């Protein structure tokens, strides 16, 4: 199990590598054997989509009293947590774990 947290796999999702194909500038009219070092300045943009299906393990606890749950605080604040600021900057105000429900040992 990865020490930083997560799922350890011998064959994880493969690395996806992307590069802009070089586009040479105008070459000299006389042959030169050296590799070209004059290229048209280029960059690329586009959209990327990733879809992941997750399997869930439902809880079947017989605990009587209510569990601890992650919840936002109703108390008034200048900004909504996990939202944008007045300058459009998105922020994550706190780390959120996964361990709120309980089960016996």
């Amino acid at each position: 199990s990865p020490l930083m947290g997560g799922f350890g796999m011998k064959h994880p999702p493969p690395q996806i590598l992307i590069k802009n194909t070089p586009v040479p500038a105008d070459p000299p009219t006389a042959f030169n054997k050296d590799k070209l070092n004059s290229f048209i300045t280029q960059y690329s943009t586009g959209q990327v989509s990733v879809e992941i299906e997750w399997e869930l393990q439902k809880e079947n606890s017989k605990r009587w009293n209510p569990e601890i749950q992650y919840t936002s605080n109703y108390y008034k604040s200048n900004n909504v947590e996990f939202a944008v600021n007045t300058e459009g900057v998105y922020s994550e105000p706190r780390p959120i774990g996964t361990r709120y429900l309980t089960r016996n040992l």
Binding site: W64, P66, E67
Partner: protein, 105 residues
């Protein structure tokens, strides 16, 4: 059936399906003799009431009655927490009622 055979089992559990939750609750009850098997006319005069706003007339019966018209009679605190944290609405659909293991002393 017979004296030495139970007429029912203890059923108390909650079953959570996709769009439905089934709550079952079993309780032990005690029923005394009310009014010494008599019907009695009652009123604010019999109870000593004086105010016009609290005057009444009615009858007290030797019968008891079963009441389960409170949510905690069916939902445990954990089930209630699940219902309120995971659903936009709910409503009762059908009812099953049982009396068993009668013991008269």
């Amino acid at each position: 059936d017979g004296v030495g055979s139970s007429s029912g089992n203890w059923h108390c559990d909650s079953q959570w399906l996709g769009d439905r939750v089934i709550t079952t609750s079993t309780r032990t009850w005690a029923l005394p003799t009310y009014n010494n098997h008599l019907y009695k006319q009652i009123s604010n005069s019999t109870s000593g009431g004086s105010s016009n706003d609290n005057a009444y007339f009615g009858y007290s019966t030797p019968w008891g009655y079963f009441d389960f018209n409170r949510f905690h009679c069916h939902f445990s605190p954990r089930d209630w927490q699940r219902l309120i944290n995971n659903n936009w609405g709910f409503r009762p659909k059908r009812l099953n009622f049982k009396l068993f293991n009668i013991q008269v002393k």
